[PDB]
Design a protein around this ligand. Sequence first.
Ligand SMILES: Nc1ncnc2c1ncn2[C@@H]1O[C@H](COP(=O)(O)OP(=O)(O)O)[C@@H](O)[C@H]1O
Lengths: 481, 481
Amino acid sequence: HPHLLAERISRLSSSLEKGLYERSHAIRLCLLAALSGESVFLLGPPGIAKSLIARRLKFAFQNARAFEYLMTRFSTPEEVFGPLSERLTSGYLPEAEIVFLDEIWKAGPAILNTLLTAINERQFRNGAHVEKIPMRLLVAASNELPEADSSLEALYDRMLIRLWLDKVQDKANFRSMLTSQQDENDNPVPDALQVTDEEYERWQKEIGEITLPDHVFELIFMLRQQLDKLPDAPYVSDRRWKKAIRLLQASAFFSGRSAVAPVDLILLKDCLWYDAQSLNLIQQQIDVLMTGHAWQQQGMLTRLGAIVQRHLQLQQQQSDKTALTVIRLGGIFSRRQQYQLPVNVTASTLTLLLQKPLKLHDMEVVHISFERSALEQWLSKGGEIRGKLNGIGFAQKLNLEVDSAQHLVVRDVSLQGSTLALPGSLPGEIKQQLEELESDWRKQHALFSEQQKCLFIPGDWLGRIEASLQDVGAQIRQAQQ
Amino acid sequence: HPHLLAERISRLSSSLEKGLYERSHAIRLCLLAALSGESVFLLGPPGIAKSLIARRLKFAFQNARAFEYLMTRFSTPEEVFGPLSERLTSGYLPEAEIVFLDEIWKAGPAILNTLLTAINERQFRNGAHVEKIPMRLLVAASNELPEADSSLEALYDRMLIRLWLDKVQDKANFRSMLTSQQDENDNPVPDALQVTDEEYERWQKEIGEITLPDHVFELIFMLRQQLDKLPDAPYVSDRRWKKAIRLLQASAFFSGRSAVAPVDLILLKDCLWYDAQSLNLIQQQIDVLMTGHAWQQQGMLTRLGAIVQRHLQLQQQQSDKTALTVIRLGGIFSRRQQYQLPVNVTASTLTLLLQKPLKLHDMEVVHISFERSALEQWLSKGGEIRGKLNGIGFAQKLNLEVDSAQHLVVRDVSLQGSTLALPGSLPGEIKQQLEELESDWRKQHALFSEQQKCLFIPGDWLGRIEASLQDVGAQIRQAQQ
Ligand SMILES: Nc1ncnc2c1ncn2[C@@H]1O[C@H](COP(=O)(O)OP(=O)(O)O)[C@@H](O)[C@H]1O
């Protein structure tokens, strides 16, 4: 039953995207906050699809009412909630579900005071007796930012999601967007994908029952302590941490999961900043946290580097056991041609060890790697050979010659000998530590290879999380060759 | 059938012009917006007849209702849409077609909030259920301009056409305007030029079916990115780009065309600016765009350079046939002055070839161009000469001296000689590639000589487009001499 819920949500948000290109993040975040009882805020220039998203999410329900209002500097509370006779609230806000308030940073003093009571209590001071407000989604958009010392900051600190919308930049997505024929006032949502009023009241209780894994708490508490030490980092109140969990628990609820997923921390990039200065700071700390401490990205880099350094140190010590013998070949040719090892070596960019280290190019080296396509030509036609040092840099020229006992002597600027050799086919101490680190990478990759189908995750984040996991796997499989 | 539609529209706008002088540009823009479902804004001092054009476009239909209301500082929404009893909207706005609202920049906050929902959704609330509004033309005149940080900018950013009206300036037009015997309250439009209600509903669906050519999309995306890089350029929202396509597609629909024509971009000069400061900036960027990349004006300039670069490559190979003999000018001077060829060369930025190429400024060169105004000064007064390389970059300094054989030796960093030469007075490969580019100019000129009969295009723009096409054609005919 929980597995079939992720399929119904994927089909509901698909019809909402039809008509607004490059706006999937501004629609999927509003649908999750509407089904969980959270708010959302938008910011940007007027004309980047900020009022249509408030009139589009109402079609996904069966008993929703829209309310598009524009707050002015001379607005009165009697024109927002309804004029009194006790207040005629026929189709306004106390009985509505999805309301829209544009330019909220300029309303009257009594208007903002009544909006704070309808959020923490979902009630209203309608005359004498109070009544509940079935508000499911609270969206607000504007253009500029409020003052640093004013009463408008009380509502900004209470809103959870802070969406950062902007104009389009891609050229391919602007072709069909410029000449679109889809109407924005029809009903693109089918009647089979709209939830009922009974399912909404039941889902509000099962969100709080999501367990909190111990591995997830290690990432939430670490991000809180990191922002406290940075002076340029914005301050986050205790209310924001409690309201953010309800958003992450609701994301895993509609994705076929029962616990808080570690990948759900990506949505925290729109719930910590407050201005344009802290926008690039929150997205930078999360990108390092998700690619450094989430699936133990940096935790394995500091462990694999010690294994490779220990492996290369043991290979340059036991080089006297395995040498390098070059076999001859028949045929009729002037220059004495040489043939490499047959099935013993098959790689193209193999590495060659050495006994006594030398100072080549005014620097030390512990291993020299050659090219298989370039080694076969020098051993047959002759000439000069080019090879890099320490696996980095360009293929510099070396003074490599042939030995009387069929070896590879490397000469330097002091006419010193250095017989090359190939590494044998892994010590027991290195293999014991390599299998334990490789098994930990498969366990972390198994968790990511099951929760990546989350609909509430942007597409640009999958290009960096997967690239950070494949980079470690491509390096750990090279030392075991 | 589509060809006969342009003749009926030309006769409809001609009857509406009778009675108003120097107002042809305002009537043509309001007629196209009325048949496409757009809006229009006027601005001017009281007395230039701003409310007469609203009562004039209603005679072009058969079932149209007028509404002329004066918005004041104490206006109420009940006196505009209709007083409630459920609202008595008998002949007002929810059931009207062409409405007029003068001095819209002073209404109450409840009036502006109801006008925003009657444009995007074409509906209006009536207590419980709602109803559609058969609005065909939205016009509103004023006198002053709104504030920079106010709530009145929400409606201004949604309007498309921004007309700039002014008092009369011509003396001949003012004499016949005061003594005009034509009545402004009669029906000058014949019964044969009035469209029916069935033809209007069918035309609103065929406008969205106009195809968007690939060459037209290159002009819209380039103009969008050009205004973003200029700080003084006004910001254009994404809503303005989408609403502008409906205006351009409607212009080509009533002109005998089935696709979007590049000449229709001239109407964008009154749909981007917002004040008197940005009025001269929008008309300047479009004038360069319509005379640069519209009919491939500059597009053939960057392609002709590749032919000249290939032509100069073959001329420098056979430069040993015709050298460059410099004659000695008459008069006894201290330094041996030199003089170029007389009538044989008259260009200001002529090019000079060379035999053996040299590595000047760490790069190769095949032709060096010198300025005629700067060559006569260096060869007569001495000093240092400055010349660019490959026709690009800045005029760098070169080590040019005089030769004993009356030539020009170019010295470099290795003290190497190089005798310069000039191209003489056409290969088969260059002629084949030149006829392909020259044929493209005739194809672009044939398109302009067929769609210039558009009535919605002003006459002053045709004087600069033809002058820009002849400049490109006059340059391509010079290399073939
Ligand atoms: N980025 C966008 N992609 C697709 N459509 C857009 C975009 N921005 C605006 N629109 C279209 O413009 C219309 C009006 O948008 P509007 O409500 O004025 O936006 P805002 O509320 O941000 O000013 C909408 O119907 C929407 O379809």
